[PDB]
Write a protein that binds this ligand. Structure first.
Ligand SMILES: CC(C)C[C@H](NC(=O)[C@@H](NC(=O)OCc1ccccc1)C(C)C)C(=O)N[C@@H](C[C@@H]1CCNC1=O)C(=O)c1nc2ccccc2s1
Ligand SMILES: CC(C)C[C@H](NC(=O)[C@@H](NC(=O)OCc1ccccc1)C(C)C)C(=O)N[C@@H](C[C@@H]1CCNC1=O)C(=O)c1nc2ccccc2s1
Lengths: 305, 305
């Protein structure tokens, strides 16, 4: 037992990280087969970033302008192209460490692991969620751009995020691996802000189920509720509406614990209206919404890769 | 910016994990050079665990009784010996993926990453601290024994923990890689419990420094305190006494933020006496004590490996 914030094993993604330098700028790239993916602003100076004309900047670059380093081995760039906000560098050597992989665009509420890298070297791994306002609550310093977010399903690494920028209040924004941003943001140093965020209701419920599985049960009340009455209450407290899709997704945890989803909704409703009275749930003093139902199941089932 | 609970990249340790089977029992082993380390109770049945006579059980085993699997490759055991609570299996093949490594015994208050494994396959990675009562707050199911805890300093993996057992209230106990338990526990299924735990004061202070580095500053008061007066207060609230060694260790964060350690102690003293008034620090509603000063520095400096 026990419940911890848990990342995927990062080794498969570690063997893919390289360092990309174009003139003054150095960030991280993702090396799969004979292609390296990195943020397109690798071609920017600091002055360039205020309002970059990316096409104009890229025509002034040759293949030899891009210094790609894997370990202490320089990779020769033999082609380059721009796809949305990402740069694709064909290299003359396929990565022998390439895992089975795919590129996916995740939905708000879903989680992934981030391998935070600097100068193409892995620094650490942490878990976060795509927030409803299409930001993530990351930990990123100068030089972290090109770090990626991923899930592992079986033996396949599903890359879903590449890091580009930091936004007001210290939250973060990035793209899928086709270069399309999550949210309405652009890769430009001009004032922009995320919309108001919301709590990921289905994840809170999954986390209450994890609490029950671990014997932390004090908040279970004796009542039930309809889906509609629950959503009227949750809306007041800035919680996402719970959908039937969400109810379905919670089915396995409901069956494991023998608590119907709408009963657990009744217990969350009392927690929102009354607070937790200085008490904790799984060692936390507020309600956690960055564990999906799949995260809870995987962790309370020992799913391996 | 941003501050997350962050694990070390786990790839170096992933390439060391194997599956050890002796008769009915299967758990995880650590393969370095031509030796596999695992918990000695791999030789126990369920009845055996109530009061195992480990020497008697081991004489009844040959090398061929131990099935060691790395991937889909069986490793031939050519020797075996018992060292305290750990079994050492010499195999005829050195692990080609062996990293530079060492075995260390960590102190209470220090942190490490856990690579949680089942059937020799990595499930996930998380960070935890050696508690002052020599337990860890882990996440471990049946079959997790032999999972290890580690730090990475430069390119060297410092193995410090191997998982053995779960204790009342869902906390965990294990050994260093020489088989000596942390704390007074034994690898036997008989009632035992950890002593009362304490808050790791130096880590709380490190975490308040991280908060300031990230712009979360509301709790900084205008006062100071002596080391002695601080410790009189902290003792009341079950906080470890702060030593001069601890003050020294906090030096870098003090210099980065320009807040003297004893001033930050004054601010923690007011937090302990008055509470946090429904407010949060780095998104947490209680004081966190599982980030060391080194963790804060490494994370707010981007140290890579
Ligand atoms: C071109 C932009 C995308 C670069 C990117 N800008 C922002 O993140 C700004 N954000 C921002 O302008 O938002 C809009 C805004 C809001 C309010 C006011 C003004 C502007 C932030 C630093 C202020 C940026 O520095 N990326 C970093 C990761 C960054 C570093 C710090 N924390 C993070 O995660 C990355 O590693 C990269 N380094 C370089 C260095 C040279 C060249 C390229 C890159 S790409
Ligand atoms: C021999 C002991 C060390 C085994 C070890 N016992 C305890 O952990 C008991 N603890 C305990 O008896 O404390 C003392 C106590 C306190 C109060 C009352 C009675 C007894 C717990 C399950 C109750 C144990 O099952 N290790 C697990 C990890 C475990 C599994 C669940 N969460 C965890 O972390 C491990 O993977 C292993 N599996 C097997 C399976 C077969 C053979 C060996 C092993 S080794």
């Amino acid at each position: 037992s026990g419940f911890r914030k848990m990342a995927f094993p990062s080794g498969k993604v570690e063997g893919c990280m390289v360092q990309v330098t174009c003139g003054t700028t150095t960030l991280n790239g993702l090396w799969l087969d004979d292609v390296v993916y990195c943020p397109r602003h690798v071609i920017c100076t600091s002055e360039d970033m205020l309002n970059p004309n990316y096409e104009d900047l890229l025509i002034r670059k040759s293949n030899h302008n891009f210094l790609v380093q894997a370990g202490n081995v320089q990779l020769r760039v033999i082609g380059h192209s721009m796809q949305n906000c990402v740069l694709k560098l064909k290299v003359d050597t396929a990565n022998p460490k390439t895992p089975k992989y795919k590129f996916v665009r995740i939905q708000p509420g879903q989680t992934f692991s981030v391998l935070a890298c600097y100068n193409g070297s892995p620094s650490g791994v942490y878990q976060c969620a795509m927030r409803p306002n299409f930001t993530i609550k990351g930990s990123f310093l100068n030089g972290s751009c090109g770090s990626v977010g991923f899930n592992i399903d079986y033996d396949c690494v599903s890359f879903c995020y590449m890091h580009h920028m930091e936004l007001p209040t210290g939250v973060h924004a990035g793209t899928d691996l086709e270069g399309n941003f999550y949210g309405p943001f652009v890769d430009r140093q001009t004032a922009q802000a995320a919309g108001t965020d919301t709590t990921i209701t289905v994840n809170v419920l999954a986390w209450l189920y994890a609490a029950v599985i671990n014997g932390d049960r004090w908040f279970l009340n004796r009542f039930t509720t309809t889906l509609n009455d629950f959503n009227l209450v949750a809306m007041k407290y800035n919680y996402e509406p719970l959908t039937q899709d969400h109810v379905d997704i919670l089915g396995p945890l409901s069956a494991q614990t023998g608590i119907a989803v709408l009963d657990m909704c009744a217990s969350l409703k009392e927690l929102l209206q009354n607070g937790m009275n200085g008490r904790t749930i799984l060692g936390s003093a507020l309600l956690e919404d960055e564990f999906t139902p799949f995260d809870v199941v995987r962790q309370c089932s020992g799913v391996t890769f």
